[PDB]
Each structure stands twice: as C-alpha cells, then as structure tokens.
Symmetry: D2
Subunit: 260 residues, 4 copies
Amino acid sequence: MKGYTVPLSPRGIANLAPAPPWHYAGTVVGVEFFTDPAAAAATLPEGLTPDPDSAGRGVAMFIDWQYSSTGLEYLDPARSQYREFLITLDAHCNGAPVAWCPYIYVDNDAAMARGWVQGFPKKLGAVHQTRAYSVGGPGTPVLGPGGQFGATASSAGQRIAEAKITLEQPVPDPAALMSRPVINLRHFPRLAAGQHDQPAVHELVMSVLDDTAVSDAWVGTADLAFLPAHGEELADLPVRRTGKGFHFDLAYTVTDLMTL
Amino acid sequence: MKGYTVPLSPRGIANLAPAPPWHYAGTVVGVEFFTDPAAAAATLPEGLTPDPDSAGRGVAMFIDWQYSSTGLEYLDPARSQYREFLITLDAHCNGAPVAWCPYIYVDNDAAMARGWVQGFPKKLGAVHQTRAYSVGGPGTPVLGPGGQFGATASSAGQRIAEAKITLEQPVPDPAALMSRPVINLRHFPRLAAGQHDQPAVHELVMSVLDDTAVSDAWVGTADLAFLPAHGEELADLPVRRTGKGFHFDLAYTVTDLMTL
Amino acid sequence: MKGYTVPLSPRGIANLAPAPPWHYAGTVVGVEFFTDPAAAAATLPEGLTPDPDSAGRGVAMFIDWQYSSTGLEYLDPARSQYREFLITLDAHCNGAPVAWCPYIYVDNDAAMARGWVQGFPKKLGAVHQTRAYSVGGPGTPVLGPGGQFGATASSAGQRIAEAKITLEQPVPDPAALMSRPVINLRHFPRLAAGQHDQPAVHELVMSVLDDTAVSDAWVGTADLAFLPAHGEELADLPVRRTGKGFHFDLAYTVTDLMTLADH
Amino acid sequence: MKGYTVPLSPRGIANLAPAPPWHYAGTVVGVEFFTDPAAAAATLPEGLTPDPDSAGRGVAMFIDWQYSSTGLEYLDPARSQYREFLITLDAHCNGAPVAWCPYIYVDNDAAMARGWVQGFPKKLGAVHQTRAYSVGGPGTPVLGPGGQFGATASSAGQRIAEAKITLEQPVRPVINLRHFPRLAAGQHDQPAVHELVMSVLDDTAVSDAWVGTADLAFLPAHGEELADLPVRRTGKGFHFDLAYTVTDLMTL
C-alpha cells in the first residue's frame, strides 16, 4: 500500500497527488481591493490580528496554473493544468504583515487535495482569465500599456467574482509582489459521534515556497465585484473600492509547510 | 470560526460540507465480479486479510445519489445531486466478512470531501447509468424482467469502467444486499519537511449507516469491464468473470463512523 | 459518405446525431408564469401574434431526459442522458393558440444539434432538478401531496433560473398538459461575404410529436425567478407572478417536423 | 428577431455567436502523421480526390484559442476561450492540393456553432496541451530545443487522441462541408444545406514556430471514427502561435 494522498494503492499511482516536490508555473491576474475592516476581521482565525495599517485591504487573484513533479507531469495537461481564484486579506501575525486566505476555488480535484494538505480551503469552481498571445492581433490584448484583461469565477453554477484590469507600466519591484507570506489553516474533521466539533487536524500554518520567481510583471487599474451566491460568503467582503490591477508570471516549488 | 469542513467562515455556510446528519437516497446499478485473488489482496490495508471463501470477489456499483441534511438541501440539486462509481472487494477483518473499498469516483466536490471524512478514497470522475421511467416507451427500459441498463465511469477524460445488466427477477432477500460492512481508511498526510511519510491521520474505519432501506430490488445477468487508464489502477483488478447484476434503490443516514 | 448531422463519415457513426426516429422519456418540473405582455411579444417571430386572452403567460420546464433511437442507445447514458431547461410563451398562429420557444438550454451537444434541426434554439447550460426516489426517507421528497422540488439552470457559469414547486394533487386532465403546439424557427446563417443577413435556412416550424404519453402527473404551487446574466436575455421576460407548478413524466418520438413558412 | 445564430432575440445578445468579424489568437501543438491512403480516401466528400503525391498524410492539431469580435469579447474568457483538436487530411481539389477536415472537437458551444457555419464538423470534447510559461522553472517546458509538450483529446468521456512532441529546430487551404439536414418526413436524406467550402482567413499571422519529433495515437472509442485513420507513422511535431480573422467563406 503506497501513495501520498488517497487512494493508497499497490503501485502508488492512483493517489490524487503524489508526495512533493510540487512544481508550479502560472500566470496571474490580480486586483488589490478594500473591504470593511470589520468584515475582513470576521474571517480571521484565532492566531491572527487585524493589520494596524491596512485592515480591510485584500488581493483577489485569478491564476492559470500548470503543475509538475519529478517526472514531467506537465506532459499530461488533462491532470496537471488548472485554473484558480482566491482572495487574501491583510493581517498581522505577531506584528508581522501576512496574508490570510479565507476562500479559494479551483477547477481540478488534485489541486483541491494538494490544497487541503497545504491548508488552502479549496472548493471546486470555474475560473477564467483573458490570455495574451505574442502573435498579437485583434484576438488578444497586448501584454503592455493599454492591455485589458478580464477574469471571472463561478461555483456551483453561480458567478461569484468578476474583474477587469488595464495595464499601464512594468512593476518596478517584481520580487516584492510576494512579500506577505500566506497564512492558512489545515483542518480535517472527525465523524465519530460526539466528535463533530473536535477536528482531528486543526492548525494554523504559513505557506513555504521554494525558489520563487516572478516575471513579466505589469501594474495598472482595476475593477472588481463579488456577487452574492447561495452557499458562499465571499460577497460578505464587499468591494468598497479597488486599488491596483496586476499581471505577472509566477513560479515556485513546494516541499515544506510551517506549522505555527 | 464556524463550519464543519473547510472553508471555515463567519456564518458556517461556505464550508464544502456541514456537519451530519447526512441523508442519502440513491438508485444503484450493481455488478458482482471476480478478479485474481492476489490482485484483490494487493489492495488490502494492514488489518484486513483475504476472504477465506470468496477472495477475488467484488462488487462494482454505479449510483445516482441525492443528498440532504437538516434543511431540505435536496431542493438545491446543483449541489446535492451527484453520480458515483465504486468497487468493493471481499475481505476479512478479524475473521469477519467485510467489504474493502479501494477506489471510488464521484462527480461532485462536496461528495468527495464528505467521502474523505468517511475514509472513502474519492476522486472526481464522470459517472452515468441508464434510467427507468414510469411513463414507458422506446426511450426507457422497463424496471422488471428483460430491462437492460448500461453504466459507465470515466476519470480525467479516460473511460475506466463499462457495464450492462439485464434484469430477470426480484431480489429474493433485499435486506441481505447490504450485509457486508464496508471498511475504509481515513488518511490525511503531512507536508512538513521530514514528515511526508508520517500522515497526520491514518486509521482504518468501519462505515456506520443509520436506518438503511432498500426498495425495488431486481437481480439478473451482467457484463463488466475495467479499462486501463493513465494514473489509475482499477484495471489491475481485471474482470475474469462477471456474476450477478443488480438494480435497487438505497437510502440511509450518516451520523457516525467507527474507528477500528 | 454517411450520416445525418455532421460529421459525415465512412460508417455514419461519428455524426453527432443519426436520422430519426428519436425516442424520448423524461421527467418534467414545470412552472406556469406571467411576464409583461409586451416583453413576450418582443420575442415573437414574424408569423406569430400575441395571444388575445393570455398574452404574457408562459411555461418554464426543467427536464431530465433520456434519448434512444433504433439500437438501444439508452444503454450509453454518457451520450443519451441529458438535462434541459426551456420556456415557452403563449401566442397565436392564424388565430390558433400555440407556444413559442425563444430560449432553451441543455447539457449535451447531441441534444443541442438535434434541437437545432428541430428549430429549438438550444445553447449549452447546466440544469438540475430534485428527484423523487421510491425508497423514500429524508434524502428525497414524496411524489405526492406536500412534495417539494427545486430546479435551476445556469449558462456560461451564470445562474439564469431558480424554481421550486410544492405538489398538491393529481393533474385533473393529464391528456391536456402542454396542449398548445410548440412553434420554433429553423435557422442557419451564411458566412459568404455580403450574405451575413441572408440566412440559408430561416423557417417557422411546428413541432410534431409521435405517440405522446404522460404519466404520474401532479399539480401544485410554484415559485420562479429569472436572473440577469451577461450574454442572455431570458431575464428580460421578468416573472411578475407565478401560476401552477407541475410534475410529470413525458414520452414521445420524433420523426417529422411541419414547415409553416420558409423565410 | 435580431442575431446571427440562434437564439434570435429582441437585442441580438442571446445568440450563440454574433456576425463576423471573428478574431482568433491561439497556440498550436501539432503532429504530422501518415495513415492508410484508402482510409483517408474513404472520408473524402464528393468533389475531393486523393492526393496523388501524399495520400494518407494528415496533420493533427491541438489548439488553445481565444476569440473576440468587435467589442473586446476576449474580456469574457468564460465564453471566448476554448480548446480544440482537429485533423486534416491531404487531398486534391480540381487538381489542386488542399486539406480536408473530417473530424474536429472543441470544449465550447459557441465555437461549435461558429464551426458549423464554417463547415467545420465540430463536436464537443475535452482538449488539453502543455503550456510554456516565460517565468520558466520545473513547472514548465522551455520553447526551444528539447522542449517537450503533451496533448490529449477526449469525447463523451473517452480518450481519442494522445500526442507528445519534442522541439528541435526553429522555422494547404482547408476544405470543409457546410451541412444542415431536414427533419420533414420523406426528406431525411435531402439536406437543406450541403455544400463544399474553402476556409478563407484574413490577416493570417504565425509566430515563434518550432518543429521537432512527435508521437501520436488515435484510440478507438464508441461513437467515433477517428481511430479508423490509424497512425501508421508520425512525421514532424510542431509548435507555433497563430492569429487570423474570419469574415468570409468560399462556396465551391
């Protein structure tokens, strides 16, 4: 019986995800937004406190990802490619700026499972972003000044987020786009009677990323809306205003995770 | 904060699945099959031994499920309805006949997550079965003698199982269809460096079903094949012989789980 | 080459749909609704006029279908099963009551193609309805008094319709359900430059159904709303009030189609 | 009653596709292949004849497409993005070399409808290709020598094509059949539209083109005939970006 996640199996192939290293390359459409500080604070786990400078600030990201491990798994895009929508909210952890992730949606089950292991609270959704093609022409925006990119996310057949950015200038400090570490919550419940309120796993974690790289980073303006949907709470973080729109490529490897 | 599974949230609505009770009503197309005893034995976890009488016997099931909890969630079929394919394999636990579930596929993420909590090693797949309609006519089989029903399962765009049954007569003892208790494995890994081989949760469990009911049960003949697929190991349990085909409605409630 | 729809092929198997007969068995959750008479009239093709008694009335249906033809195609549910949401609107054709279908959504491409051939203006969508299971218990409504059934439709990831019905009693006259014949529009455009407004096929048709049967028909109360969505116009027929809710099984065969007027 | 395709509507918004112009930008992973000449010939419509020099040759393409029209429709990727797998087969038209398209699969209904209008015999499928990301790293190949790309296509939950290319080195009109049947009794063998057409592309552009080696197989599937053009051997694999606009179609 081999495997990292279920199903465990004789050859360790059937598992939804094998053991790390997990490698990632993606393209991000991002929007800085501001919600009610109290609404953001309401989502925070016990160990985190509101950001004393930017409470209410968040970032919405729509990402086209490609995953691989040690065996050129990216040659199997029917399993290795997925699209993802998440928000993070500014917070502090012991006086240090961090980014809490309350909600995140993906269109792939393996990504969802790798997510839960990392503490990303992933559910299935349908996510899309405008793509730039280097050939150019009227079927594509330019990845440069004036380039417009749309993005959307749905869950259970309901639209939950719609966004648009217009690029203006290169990001002068690309590496600093990843400055705030992400905080997550590994959580796995119990089903034994009497224990439904006593999860087997429940721990605050900090995302650890190896060999992070950012390229082709652009900044501009942005529009963003969250839409009310049955069975979702994203829109309870209403967009009071939008800040910068961002477009960049992102790569890293995951082999570790810090339990806080 | 509130909720049973992730994401936890201010109102406990965004969670992929709320706490039990979980109620189920389903229609099952079932096929008894026989594979190599050694191939079946290779899938067994520590704690289970080969069945001394029927090693190699298993049952493939294709199910059209509807879920609900305490608030008429069946009124939201976009979330509550799903289709599922699984196999069980005859085994023994401490000299008692049981049914081990190595592989199971479902077309809904909430069902998948509830599955992991139960120890069902669910992955996403596309599952279909012929339906009988009371109105009759050339668009439907009869739920009765001569009625033919097809069923298929795919995962990652690859067909993994194809089945057909032809009904002959009512099941003589419908209550006995669910006689072998199902054994599963709750399993949730760690990502902390050095601990990828030390899962946080790893325990054999017995499925506990409340108020189990079966109706409209028919038996007849069957054909079943498992197809080799990249990233799957189902077809490593080759169908050497097909036994009985079954068609029945099934209902039960989940509130508990027995850790062995 | 062989085949009925594209792709045509050496063996006539690859086609999205073969020739009729097309057989259908389905379960319907239906809602009678009332919108603005002028909104309904705005969708009507040339040839149809407003209903002088019930202008603004329509019916929304959510259907779990199973298709088959001459070879037990229902044994291949990955191709033959699908879910469908449509509306019809009361109208008149030369003084006769008919039902115009402006919008319809389905989760299966073969159904979409067979639809286009019939003049049903089908697009892809995601459609669901609560199911009743004979075994009973807390996972299912009863198909009977008090039974509640929800239904929804989305397109392109946007929710466009949400419905609920509560059953009260058997339909008194099931034979008279959806008694208005359905009118559709076969339409296939041209792409040749200069001809983008000169479609190759453009004709009003009346749906012809063979051996129609209904069973297990119940009526009760209903709630229905259409939701605004980008790239959709369904919600421009706002539900001002709802009438009866319905639940029934439906079966028929298609082999024919009546052309009313070409272009 | 405005609109280009159905549904026609009061505002012309609900239609599956509006009128041209239709603009496209895409990335192609492709494989040249050789099947049995007689198998290719069996797919040919009236009006096309076997290629006297390369009968049996075809090309398989897996494409990640983005569409737009006159209103920045590419800002709505939930409708405007799609993935497509097709094959073409070498043939001749009136003594002249062309590429016949017998089979093609897309993951989007609007693309399927625009396809039928063009005479592409599109059905729904699930199509995927490896993507190259500029940022680089172990999650992506690098366009250039040694760069490896996989691609697959499925239909009705069945895998029908699997391909892989390895790039080595930097670097025919399509014929289709518009076809729309009749349902009126007695007329099921008498289609309302049935005409051979040549694809007309405006402002075509190709960029960043690479060729290399390739593997390709078509898998037998219920309800499909693609694998009845068995890949006997593969030629070149290739990778490139492609753009063009559609406003016209030539009836032959």
